[PDB]
Paper text:
Thus, we chose to engineer the loop L1 of the 56-residue immunoglobulin-binding domain B1 of the streptococcal protein G (GB1).35–38 The solvent exposed loop L1 in wild type GB1 is a type-I β-turn with lysine at the i + 1 position and threonine at the i + 2 position that lacks a COi+1 → COi+2 n → π* interaction. However, to have a better control over the turn conformation, we decided to introduce a type-II′ β-turn. Through subsequent X-ray crystallography and computational analysis of synthetic GB1 proteins with amino acid substitutions at the i + 2 residue of the β-turn, we show that amino acid side-chain identity and its rotameric conformation have a direct influence on the strength of an n → π* interaction. Gratifyingly, the thermal denaturation of the GB1 proteins shows a good correlation between their stability and the strength of an n → π* interaction at the β-turn.
Our earlier results indicated that the β-branched amino acid d-Val at the i + 1 site stabilizes a type-II′ β-turn more than d-Ala. Thus, we synthesized 2, with d-Val–l-Ala in loop L1, which readily crystallized and X-ray diffraction data were collected to a maximum resolution of 1.9 Å. The structure of 2 overlaps closely with the tertiary structure of GB1 (backbone RMSD 0.39 Å), although with a significant displacement of loop L1. Gratifyingly, the d-Val COi+1 and l-Ala COi+2 in the type-II′ β-turn engage in an n → π* interaction, where the torsion angles of l-Ala at the i + 2 site (ϕ, ψ = −59.7°, −42.2°) are remarkably close to the mean torsion angles of a right-handed α-helix (ϕ, ψ = −62°, −41°)42. Thus, to obtain a quantitative estimate of the n → π* interaction energy (En→π*) at the i + 2 residue in 2, 3, and 4, we resorted to NBO analysis, which clearly indicated a decreasing En→π* in the order 2 > 3 > 4. The Ramachandran plot of the i + 2 residue in the type-II′ β-turn of 2, 3, 4, and 5 revealed that, as the strength of the n → π* interaction increases, the torsion angles of an amino acid in a non-helical region in the absence of the stabilizing intramolecular hydrogen bond are gradually altered to occupy the right-handed α-helical region. Therefore, we chose to substitute the solvent exposed COi+1 in the type-II′ β-turn of 2 by CSi+1. Thus, towards the synthesis of i + 1 thionated GB1 (d-Valt–l-Ala; 2a) (the thionated residue is denoted by superscript “t”), we obtained a clean 46-mer polypeptide up to the l-Alai+2. However, on completion of the 56-mer 2a on a solid support, following the acidolytic removal of protecting groups, the mass spectrum corresponded to a 45-mer fragment without the l-Alai+2.
Numbering used by the authors: 1 to 56
Write the structure that this text describes.
């Protein structure tokens, strides 16, 4: 299924997606995406909409 990540670094905000087999596998992809783009901090997950957020 399609999973979504909403990043908030502060000034820079964005949204990416990933096609993953389960929520844990999307989470791993998103965690390394966030780190590679300078956003590190507070995570959330909305199971009903397959949506993660990470906020600096």
């Amino acid at each position: 299924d399609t999973y979504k990540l909403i990043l908030n670094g502060x000034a820079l905000k964005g949204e990416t997606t990933t096609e993953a087999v389960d929520a844990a596998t999307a989470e791993k992809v998103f965690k390394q995406y966030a780190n590679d783009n300078g956003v590190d901090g507070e995570w959330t997950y909305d199971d009903a909409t397959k949506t993660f957020t990470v906020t600096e």
